[PDB]
């Protein structure tokens, strides 16, 4: 129940950072990976003798409520026009709120999809999809 | 304990990078418990215990010695089971080095034979009628310089009158000089007693003098000088109408600035009621008299220093049998007092198993374990050191510190490069059966391991696991100690109006149930608890089953046709 | 890459040295130019890149290849660190984030192949107030210099 | 193993090409298991185990002996299969040669008679106030000469005074240099006290002396001459004005220039405090005392060194029964201590069967195997090396250490040019059934080989293939070693409460399941596995089928005239 004693990361305990700033009004974040695993089969038997890894695919999703200031478009972390070619890679960190310790990091993030919605009575929702080169979980120990 | 070193003040925002042969080294990891060590060590205050969170602090304060090597073993033995926080105290009763030249008694913040390599000197700055200081600590190559020392502000009298005189009086009872009077043409304007009250700081005096239409006191820009008024120097009849009259606090300016020097302390020499020996420039001269002293014959006073510190594990870096007895007696005292502890000991090189039994015969105590093996370790900078057993004891202590309460050090690997002797299977069995903890060697296809065969204390009987296996006893120790301290807070400490025996029983059962939910304890009897209350006292009795580890496996193979 | 063993335009030289003279001269920490001719093909080559500094125990000091690459590396790293960290609040910064940044910087550096692989775990940090301290371990770019061969005739 | 002797680092980038008649006669092949040997060897030092990888290193390390002949076959016994990594150790307790003349003691790291052929002498060089040293070694054709030995940078004086005097003074309890002084006329100018600091380094002293306006310091022309001031010879009143003064350290400079050169090592003679005697020139002298000792009746102390070193297929290079008795007991203990060993032996130039039956009667341990034949091998040099049986055993051992785990040495070829004995079919049958290995000659269609008939060991009972034959035992030995390590890691360091019989059973099936996929074993009856658990103890039984091998066939012929 207490802040420190809870063994499980609630959404409250977690903080999301980009380039030395927190991301305000964040709502969701998902990370998916595929090692390109395959099975080896031969004439001798149907059963797969071994499994091997072929290709590494890594994507992370983020959703956000469009603030009147400090949006991804305003902040330059995301781009709309041809300016994207002038945007370098980005690194994302997911952080423990209590001590600012690191939980997991995404390296070499680059954008894939950018989505935006407006509606009569809902809050403006901003979504973006990032593809990255590697993901590492170090500096914890 | 004391975390000795606070921040260094900084001057500029910058990033600097410099190649080096060596890095910052290890670091203390998160830990439930604390690890205490005593040993030969250069640097630091004798008979004082220091807490270390990083190897950098250990280098910075425990400048060298086998103790510092022990810390490296504690954190470098296993990255997964890195040892926790550290408490350290040097056995050697080192002395400071001292220099008494130029009206100043100069002493070293450093204690030991190194302290004589400190050189300090004063110089005369003819440019501003001021003294100058330089401090060089050659071994650490630490160079410091101060200039314009003593001069705070200048006074000019601007009127046409014949003579303006500045005077400061002296008190011989306390040796202070606490008056400052401006007189012009045998007439006085104001007098400032420098004994607090109206003119405690020189800032108010400067404000007071500046208000006078015929005078101006102007601040010296070379160094912050807002000293208290009482620190002004003895001054007698200085002509204010002249080009410049200086107001001086030679020791006061020295006292403030020199406090920030990392090597030196300053005292003002009283002549040998004797007046003050004048502070004057002198040659940069070595400090003298700093030594390491000798270790005490008995370490009991040192061990008593660690009482009420919470360090569960303590390791003396020695092989002396008498010293081991002192620790065992000390640990016995603390355990009964309410501060459980464990001691890890190991002596000499390749000592005979019979001598090990001799130590066992002399000493049989569950609160201590005796390590037999001696070996060599590869450490930072590539140097490999061949060391006695008590350095191996640190590795066991550092390992056990990192491990959780419920997990034993049994069978875990160790990084030690090699061992003096390779015990056989029968040799190992004799040691373990006789309450001796040892190290075992095994070889893979292309790998080699050094393993801790089992947890055993000097206590021989196998009947009771808590007595034999320190891991089991440790689990009981932390369970009870954590329970009681919590219980003290709720009922004794916190204001409780009423209490019944049954209420205590429920609270105990609540506590135990939580531990099981955290997997700290496997099972226990719920109905076995007993509570009795008698006036202002209560008796509590309960039982919990110790955890059992996996020891033996026997295998047989049968070959057959088809 | 080093200047070692690469050719030169020079038509002729005043001096040509013996192998022992080159060895003594090279070990002293002096650059020399050697003449090579084989199969009617003549060049002038840079024997080595060692500097005036004497101690071979410090390749970063002795040889140009280590120093040159090291000089640019620190310049690039220093600029990035100053921009990322200095103009930010201490409260949201900590040791762990610093450690991750370094690994990412060394990670992208390795992909470019400007360095050999590095022990990522060795990186560790300390933080206190406005001040922080960092230590890291990295392996250099090597270079193959000498070889040895032997011959045997078995009459068949 | 004791590390192989090093080599000088790179001097210059180049391509070194040379020609030798013999060159490399062999080298190690990729392997996991290791091959061990002991025998007579001229080189190295005794009671030491060395790691061999190439023939040239062993040849240089062991200049002569039966060892290299045994080694050469092992790396060339078969084109495909080679022994791989080899451990070797010389038996006899050889000693180095020595000489003590002119304040110096000369000793050779090489132990043996050949060391006496080393000639070392000192010559006086008046042109530079120095000594020359020459070494001659006929057998290795190793010669070394050095000039201007014992000279350190000179000093000269420039002032007016009648004299400038220099001295070097020594510590009375160590004979080390403690102080050296510069003096001008009747007055002193400077001195350097050898207590650390810049006073240790002649490089700094050159700078410091040059800084004096009246003194000059200049270095020798023959390469570097830097040396610590501690090594400087005692000098008194060296006149600096008229001529430059030479700084002397004959011992220090000699050691540096003669560095490496392991054929010769130097010790300074303590004159009969035993003062450091002055070094004197002396004519070239043959060393003495270089000897090769006798082999003791018991090599058990020698054999124990190979324990805990991961060896396999040991081969002792001797025929006498006493050695074979020791090793048979030794390997037995190795099997007990979880590091199983196997051995291959020979009985000399037996060339007869009846003696073998007596020997086989003596030895019937399953862990040892005997070979009967003796023959001639052609070396790389082409010598018709006629050798006893126990050299042929090495070829078998060299082949076996290269062959894979699950295959036998049976029926495979051999390099041997010719044999002393060829047997009948009945003789082979009787010999084979007795439990003795033999080599047979086969010729058909003008194609001749020598083959291993079988792999049976000295153990008699055919009813136990695991005991009788190498293929079952070798594979079995590795299997248990791998399984034992995994089980210890998985289970021992865990709590008993979460462990049970069923999980143990599943683990075994998975281990045997993945083993079967690798095809290292035949299929196994998974159901047969069953377990019992009680407290900290557990018992396991399993059934497995071995790897078979097809040996004999039978054919018949019929002609039907059409």
From TrEMBL, chain A:
InterPro entries: Phi812_tail_tube. Pfam families: Phi812_tail_tube (PF26461). This is Capsid protein.
From TrEMBL, chain C:
It comes from the Viruses. This is Major tail sheath protein. The chain holds residues 428 to 583 of 587 of the full protein.
